[PDB]
Design a protein around this ligand. Structure first.
Ligand code: HEM
Ligand code: HEM
Ligand code: HEM
Lengths: 160, 160, 160, 160, 160, 160, 160
């Protein structure tokens, strides 16, 4: 039998809650950024949302294989920025929360002997550190050239 | 100024809550159906989820244009089936809920003079009646040929 | 002069009345079958309707050439099935009615010396016996594998 | 449940009766025009018939979705012209009848809250006013250049 | 042995005499029409001549197969028009003569049991009624728009 | 008869007056922007002018169909900016004027039962709210990054 | 019901018996001709066999449609030639037998009112007179140039 560990399912569900939160956060940021004129940042944000959708699908699939029930009924609390730098910082804070949850989860899976699930958390963890490297670089850039120049760089002219 | 009616924003947010619910419901049904072997139904269910994602994006965009704040923080309650016919019925019940909310909303927008928003609700309404025609036909079919033959029809052989 | 025999025009008009009936019957059966889930049978039924449309056009053209007036004002009485086997049987009964009317009509044209019109009825007659061979085979099949398996065979999975 | 309003089904059936009438009228006009030599007008008339066939299919589909029974058993009374200008006028009179029936029907659907059906009648209404603009222009042309020149314009030379 | 009925050969030869007449009539009409400026009618007339050439070849072939001798030595009397409407009427009169000869001939072949020859006369008969429908339509057109407009329609401008 | 309501024609003419105004305003803004160096904004402005030309053509066509006379003799008063932000604001003010006129007009058409014209005003209304969303986003951008950076973003380098 | 006339089925079976005979005769002639070196005649003979196979399939299909049982258990007596001219004459004798049986059969079908079957016999009859024209021409040729030259003409050189 393939019935998984209850503590393992719990961690996948906890990870799923964060991923659904991040999907919604990134998508709302995409629409707000677009409304503010920052069409190029907006596009990156849409892609980040779609990437997290793919993660959530992977977690769902692993939960059902372990004969657990995935919880899509509730969403982890959203951080909504009100200008460009706040959007980047709200996202980064979310990715650190995610990193820390995935770090704890791979250790729990490891101790309980569920090594395929550990491997899933390890892949999520390397992902989030990817997103974290990206966001921290953008924020350094914003700080070195200033918000208004970072805004201009990430906006399109009116004929696009 | 384009600041919208507060009652109108409320209806768009209420519609958004149902759409996020339906996205999650349809996607979970897709994964459960796949796990049970019904790969062809599963695929239709994935597409229904993606279609509702597009609706939710449209509502979000309209809320932000009216200078409201879209609520993605909470999800309307999910109906999760445990066999094929329950999946179809849970979906249909959700689409009737949606129809009724969109019918009320186009009337509120109409009375308040926000005719572009009325037109959005009218397009959602014709959509949901599309999904409702589809689901009711499948359920009639299931009833006339029986669940196990409806299951067989909607499953793939092992080499696909 | 090409003014045709009054009895000949009468038979073409009588044939036209049956063809308009069959066009409507087959088309309504197409839509009902589709609503019930039998999309593959439905498609064959649409094509049968379109074929009878072509026959009706041929009769109309022959009536006008003989300087008669084609009657499109009334439609011969329709047989509407309420399940798959009734649809097939209602169609077959209509095709036998048609066969018998065309058999009588080619004899009347023959006796009156209008051999081009005889040839039109002969072509319609061979057609209807084509449709009759098709319907009788389907009904034998339905009887040997059972209605619910005949229904399943003639339905599409949900992703089509 | 999706069971529709009885008054709404009645209007769709009334519209269907007019559309079947117009299909037959336009098709008979096509064949008569061709017999008289007006092959170019004839072709436009064939296309108008086929367009109304598509409308009738849409009404049928909406009736069956509302769980009514579409009546294809009877055809609304035909107006058959005996020269070019009479053909155009008989058609135009039919399109005004249609316009008026669709105008009443969208109001009935609107009052009863069946807004998807209202939207169908609104699309038919804009269609018929399209056909009406076309016919009225042709008739003005006929009047300004004279019937025999309008006939010549709408006929082909003998090698086509 | 395949030696045919003497009465049957006689009818094929009688039909051949009419076809050779019609070949010559149509070809002369083609050249006269061209000389008068009616290049488009002229072209249709050339094709009608070539079609009758094909018929004459078919009759010749059937006569020789029945071990008769086809008579190409004499031509049935020609009707030569002197203006457009006379050309059309001379042709039509010839096609009615042909129709009547082919109608009698298929009956003679039928009574004598030569059913392949009957079938040849039946195909010629349906042909001639084709040509008759065409000519009668053109003549109706000529009458409704007038000879000079029918002439103009069937002429080319000077640069063609 | 298709003679339209006098009050309806009046609204179409009033809408036409605003559209001709906007065509001229947008085109003059295009040329002024180009002269000032803002070639990318200039291009968007040319396209906005051409879009309003298409609207004016639609109104003209509807007026003539209703047997009214479209007034192209006078142009609604123009708002001409003298720097980038004034150009955007003059345009936006014009689009709000337009929105409000189209909102009133669809209500008048609705009350008078001219539903095809209502549908035209509804399509114009959704258009103008499109243009309004675009302009308001650009102006927010201008305000957040500053006029001179918004100018730089919307200008081309000297080799283009 | 489509149950056919017993006398009609009998004629189709009688025709089928002749066709199976001719299939076997022509195929054996093909192989014997090839063995004797007459590879070009041999090829024509193979095609004649395959054509008669197609006829036999048509008769079989018509018998089963009329709810008779086709008799493939016995073969009509074969005529086997022992040189080229005997092969051609044996074939021709078989085709005359066939012609005569099909002539009688179309009359029986005609008297009994089975006109689709009459039409099948009429098509077979015109076929056989085709084969008869071909064979009689070849035999005339053989007689005019002599057997050994007819043999040489219908043989291939050794490198083919
Ligand atoms: C359980 C939650 C969700 C799941 C499992 C999910 C899953 C997916 C997947 C697998 C894709 C395919 C992307 C691709 O084509 O590579 C996708 C695309 C997309 N998603 Fe989600 N998603 C979720 C939530 C949302 C939400 C809340 C929205 C809000 C609008 C959304 C909007 C979209 C859109 C617009 C697309 C792509 C449309 C296009 O490419 O044209 N999704 N989603
Ligand atoms: C006098 C009665 C009718 C005549 C003469 C007629 C004739 C025709 C003809 C010649 C075609 C062309 C088919 C092709 O493309 O090969 C056609 C197609 C069609 N007919 Fe009819 N028809 C009649 C009645 C109807 C009715 C009652 C309906 C009901 C909806 C209908 C619906 C259609 C449709 C949907 C098509 C083809 C559309 C497509 O291919 O996308 N027709 N008809
Ligand atoms: C200041 C006044 C106007 C200016 C400067 C202007 C300028 C232009 C230009 C440069 C074009 C490009 C044509 C091409 O593609 O070669 C154009 C096209 C066009 N204009 Fe105007 N125009 C003016 C007034 C109008 C008006 C009053 C109308 C009324 C409807 C109109 C309708 C159109 C349309 C429909 C097109 C082309 C659309 C197509 O090609 O599909 N214009 N105009």
């Amino acid at each position: 039998s393939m019935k998984g560990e209850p503590k393992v399912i719990e961690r996948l569900n906890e990870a799923l809650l964060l991923e659904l939160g991040a999907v919604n956060q990134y998508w709302l940021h995409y629409r707000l950024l677009n409304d503010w004129g920052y069409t190029r940042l907006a596009k990156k944000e849409r892609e980040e949302s779609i990437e997290e959708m793919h993660h959530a699908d992977k977690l769902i699939d692993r939960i059902i294989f372990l004969e657990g029930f995935p919880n899509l009924q509730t969403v982890s609390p959203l951080r909504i920025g009100q200008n460009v730098k706040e959007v980047l910082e709200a996202d980064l804070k979310g990715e650190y929360d995610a990193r820390a949850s995935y770090k704890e989860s791979r250790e729990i899976c490891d101790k309980l002997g569920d090594y395929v699930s550990k491997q899933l958390f390890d892949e999520l963890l390397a992902d989030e550190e990817g997103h974290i490297d990206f966001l921290e670089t953008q924020l350094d850039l914003l700080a070195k050239i200033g918000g208004e120049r970072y805004g201009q760089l990430n906006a399109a002219p009116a004929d696009e």
